[PDB]
Amino acid sequence: HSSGVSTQSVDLSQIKRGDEIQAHCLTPAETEVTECAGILKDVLSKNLHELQGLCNVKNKMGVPWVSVEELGQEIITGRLPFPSVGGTPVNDLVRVLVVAESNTPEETPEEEFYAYVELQTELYTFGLSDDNVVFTSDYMTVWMIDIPKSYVDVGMLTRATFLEQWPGAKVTVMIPYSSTFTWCGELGAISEESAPQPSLSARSPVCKNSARYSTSKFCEVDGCTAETGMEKMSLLTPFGGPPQQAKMNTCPCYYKYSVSPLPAMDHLILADLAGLDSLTSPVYVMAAYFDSTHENPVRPSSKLYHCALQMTSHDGVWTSTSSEQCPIRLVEGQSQNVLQVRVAPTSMPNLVGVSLMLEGQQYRLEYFGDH
């Protein structure tokens, strides 16, 4: 289709010079294309589609071809449904990879393939120039560029300009959130007429009006008590959505904001997913949080973090990866058809968000803001 959400395991071991790519191409290393440029030539020539194996998740949307008669510019533009909060001015840089390509037309075209991609933010517009090229082929181009993480989030706009309405034309934005997790935002060109066909990606602010959770006053009304086990689940998956069903719990907001004594809990379920017995791709869950160590009250270091966990099926059984740092963890729910996202109540105060990504569905849970 012209849009969707996919997942796959990413084993760098079995990926030609995988380690090297992730090192010089997806990590903000050298301030020049040379290193990554020379690794891609070796790899991408042996396999022009290798880079697709680096995405743990791929989120694609169908965008209409907008034309510019005067200049003969066929342009596609879109706003990627970024999975999590990019970062804080206090964070470092992300080195994102951009890929523009189209189907190789069986009939030699008039002009040579061409694409100018630019990512614009309210202030600066990062335009992948020539100096950013790290690879080129008849029908494909790859750029590399460092961006302050805080910029990579909703607001950032993606624009690809071609000289023709190339077949199978698409732009991809590879975004590595953690050394071991990469999310790919893709834009597929569709007919001028066609209306934008996004993916089932939602963003949900779980604690609207965080003031409401400043105390235990509304606990009873909200249905967040030691009785129900601090569980107030709401559905995330729409009526037409896939055969899997995801839901979120809002009771944690209390544990993040309350200054009123709350029920002691071993853990807290942030969300659950049903329908694993029929799902055939892994499930990822990324968390965005602030480091626990305290800082100088005179200079509060707001450095944001990200750890992504993955529930996979091995011979029919589902298991979760784990991190001695990650504040959350994935556990099997009632059966092997249910998956749970948990966290220690004491982690909540520093939890900013979590994102649930599985075949055909993506949800961005925010524990701050009201939108």
Partner: protein, 64 residues
């Protein structure tokens, strides 16, 4: 049955509205906290390190 404090109020409370106060002692609790009970029977989590909490404690003590 056991309730704990996960956040402390950074806002002082008028000693004129603080009935009692107890300390968190349970092992099932993660944070060391002073729980103030108001005159309206409402509890609030506070931080022992903070001076207003301590002083508010010298009042609640030297009155009984």
């Amino acid at each position: 049955a056991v309730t704990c404090c996960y956040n402390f109020t950074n806002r002082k409370i008028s000693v004129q509205r603080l009935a009692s106060y107890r300390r968190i002692t349970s092992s099932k609790c993660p944070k060391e906290a002073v729980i103030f009970k108001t005159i309206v029977a409402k509890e609030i989590c506070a931080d022992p390190k903070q001076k207003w909490v301590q002083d508010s404690i010298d009042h609640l003590d030297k009155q009984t």
